[PDB]
Amino acid sequence: TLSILVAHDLQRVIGFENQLPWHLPNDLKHVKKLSTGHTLVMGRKTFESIGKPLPNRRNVVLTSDTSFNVEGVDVIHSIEDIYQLPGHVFIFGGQTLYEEMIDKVDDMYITVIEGKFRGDTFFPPYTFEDWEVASSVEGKLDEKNTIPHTFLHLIRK
Numbered sequence: 001t002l003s004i005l006v007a008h009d010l011q012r013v014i015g016f017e018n019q020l021p022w023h024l025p026n027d028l029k030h031v032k033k034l035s036t037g038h039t040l041v042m043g044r045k046t047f048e049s050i051g052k053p054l055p056n057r058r059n060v061v062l063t064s065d066t067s068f069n070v071e072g073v074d075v076i077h078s079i080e081d082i083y084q085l086p087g088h089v090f091i092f093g094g095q096t097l098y099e100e101m102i103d104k105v106d107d108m109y110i111t112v113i114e115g116k117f118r119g120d121t122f123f124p125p126y127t128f129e130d131w132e133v134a135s136s137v138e139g140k141l142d143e144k145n146t147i148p149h150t151f152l153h154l155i156r157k
């Protein structure tokens with residue numbers, strides 16, 4: 001099973017200066033819950049923006065760097081390698097990986113952040129003509145999560 005897992009704003013911003021532009025604990029929980037016991041595949045820049053693997057799942061980094069070696073991280077050097085990974089694989093970012101994979105994934109788990117942030121990296125345009133809304137769930141707005149957000153599960157028609 002091949003899924004995208006992304007959070008993007010109203011204009012599809014996903015990043016600014018190698019960080020996420022917003023702080024949303026609800027979405028971090030969502031990510032942890034969805035991907036625990038499974039596999040994350042991410043581009044080299046995305047990995048480096050955090051610098052350590054997320055515990056309790058497989059962390060896979062795509063890079064052309066033949067020297068890349070990080071404890072608790074598995075390395076791949078081709079998009080083709082993704083299809084050989086067993087289990088439920090989540091494409092975890094960043095822009096380059098999403099652009100390469102959006103036409104290939106079975107489904108998408110998207111957190112829509114209902115704001116407009118300054119960004120330098122974007123999720124690719126997509127249309128609901130191509131995607132069924134399996135579920136759409138409003139996130140809870142509170143003191144620690146103060147940006148409205150909606151968890152979408154989209155399945156390719």
Ligand SMILES: NC(=O)C1=CN([C@@H]2O[C@H](COP(=O)(O)OP(=O)(O)OC[C@H]3O[C@@H](n4cnc5c(N)ncnc54)[C@H](OP(=O)(O)O)[C@@H]3O)[C@@H](O)[C@H]2O)C=CC1
Binds near residue numbers: 008047077
């Ligand atoms: N809001 C969200 O849900 C998320 C946001 N982000 C954000 O995304 C931004 C980073 O995105 P971006 O700059 O696109 O970087 P990526 O994380 O997509 O990393 C790009 C790198 O991945 C490697 N790579 C990608 N495709 C291939 C390939 N086909 N073969 C070999 N290597 C490949 C290359 O590494 P190398 O150069 O080493 O060869 C490349 O430079 C950050 O701001 C981050 O915060 C990231 C994840 C989620």
Ligand SMILES: COc1cc(-c2ccccc2)cc([C@@H](C)C#Cc2c(C)nc(N)nc2N)c1
Binds near residue numbers: 006029032048049
């Ligand atoms: C090094 O590997 C990473 C680990 C994390 C992470 C670390 C702690 C808690 C949750 C996620 C985040 C990332 C970033 C780049 C991401 C993401 C992401 C988020 C925060 N939300 C959704 N909905 N999708 C994503 N791909 C990379």
